[PDB]
Design a protein around this ligand. Structure first.
Ligand SMILES: C=CCN(Cc1ccccc1C(=O)N[C@@H](CCC)c1ccc(OC)cc1)Cc1ccc2c(c1C(=O)O)OCO2
Ligand SMILES: C=CCN(Cc1ccccc1C(=O)N[C@@H](CCC)c1ccc(OC)cc1)Cc1ccc2c(c1C(=O)O)OCO2
Lengths: 149, 149
């Protein structure tokens, strides 16, 4: 549970926003890329796993599950690469709702920056700090610290 | 102290590696940019503060301390922007040593990727996971979890 993350790819402004969600907390990291490719997804997972103890990643689609470059990055970084089949049907709903909430936040900040990437990092900040009471950033630290002890 | 980070800029391959160090743990995040500017440093701090609870940042030089774009990002993200004067002289030394260790790790991995940015994220991963017994990634989670509770 503490080490499981889900990839999610959504689109805005003709660009792709790649998101990693820590499933147990709802904490996210995200980036804007011009298109989803294996190399961009592999680089994103390398960043993520140097920053949090990523044990398992559920990939977002079959092309990133198949990609040799993504499998190579997961080898390099010690991540178990898994498919992202929603065996629990509640799961695609949770992801869908997250994409809608993120796009809502992006719209609320959009005029505060020229570049979409800046708006997306403002939305990551607001999402991770929102108290639901604990925020997702607090939840992820508590879960992982509890795992370490 | 759980919320204090130090900026650090080092150079390699004619490019700039911008590093944020969580001072109490030694955990780092880093990126490669073509040159240090206010806009790049501001964007880097916006990413960092969406991911960890960044209360104070000691800037790496006077140009980033003066920059109104950097001050604006620190406003946006709730960070107190401070100078980085090494009132404790041991601080100079610790940062210098870290830059030498990072460059050493980058050389150990450099042939495993074409682009310097990939080598620098491999180095961030090795640095944060190295046990010296706890790693810096474990220390930062413990410190922040202790602070939440
Ligand atoms: C002079 C800087 C260039 N722009 C100017 C701008 C252009 C259009 C609209 C608003 C603004 C504006 O000044 N907004 C303020 C917030 C106002 C409430 C703001 C300040 C610092 C900040 O730092 C992260 C983010 C936002 C901001 C910017 C900075 C760094 C970046 C960017 C961008 C970008 O515009 O996307 O892209 C990647 O690195
Ligand atoms: C076909 C992919 C392009 N290259 C090929 C390459 C070129 C030169 C030398 C080695 C290799 C090589 O295959 N290395 C393996 C490890 C071998 C032990 C590797 C695999 C996945 C990985 O994912 C993060 C990192 C490394 C890797 C790469 C991927 C994604 C990126 C990159 C780069 C880059 O080369 O910098 O830049 C930004 O996004």
């Amino acid at each position: 549970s503490p080490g499981i993350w889900q990839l999610d790819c959504t689109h805005l402004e003709g660009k792709v926003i790649l998101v990693a969600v820590h499933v147990a907390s709802g904490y996210i990291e995200a980036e804007v890329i011009p298109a989803e490719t294996g190399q961009e997804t592999a680089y994103f997972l390398l960043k993520l796993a140097g920053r949090w103890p990523v044990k398992t990643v559920h990939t977002d689609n079959g092309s990133n599950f198949t990609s040799t470059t993504v499998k190579a990055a997961c080898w390099w970084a010690g991540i178990k690469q898994e498919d992202g089949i929603p065996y629990n049907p509640q799961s695609q709903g949770v992801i869908e709702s997250m994409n809608k909430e993120l796009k809502k936040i992006i719209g609320q900040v959009r005029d505060q920056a020229e570049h979409l990437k800046t708006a997306v990092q403002m939305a990551v900040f607001i999402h991770n700090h929102k108290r639901k009471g604990y925020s997702a950033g607090e939840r992820i630290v508590d879960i992982i610290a509890t795992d370490i002890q």
